[PDB]
Amino acid sequence: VKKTSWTEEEDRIIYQAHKRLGNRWAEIAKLLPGRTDNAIKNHWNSTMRRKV
């Protein structure tokens, strides 16, 4: 079956950018146009609640 539902690579991208910038989805969202600020923000603060 297809993995989908946020790829492992995308998670690494957001993690790296979040660790350096923070909750600046306004910036991360630019790196991933397909992923809106709301999409990333929600996904992170629900699935990957690892603010560190």
Other CB atoms within a 10 A radius of the CB of residue 6 amount to 16
Identify whether the C-beta of residue 41 lies closer than 8 Å to the C-beta of residue 32.
Answer: no
The domain defined by 1-52 folds into Arc Repressor Mutant, subunit A (1.10.10)
Question: Measured between alpha carbons, how far is residue 36 from residues 1, 2, 22 in Å?
Answer: 26, 22, 16
Chain-centre distance of CA 37, in angstroms? 9
Give the residue extent of every domain in the chain.
1-52
Instruction: Cite the DSSP H helix spans in the chain.
Output: 8-20, 25-31, 37-44
Select from 13, 11, 37, 35 the least CA-distant residue to 24.
Answer: 37
Identify whether the C-beta of residue 31 lies closer than 8 Å to the C-beta of residue 50.
Answer: no
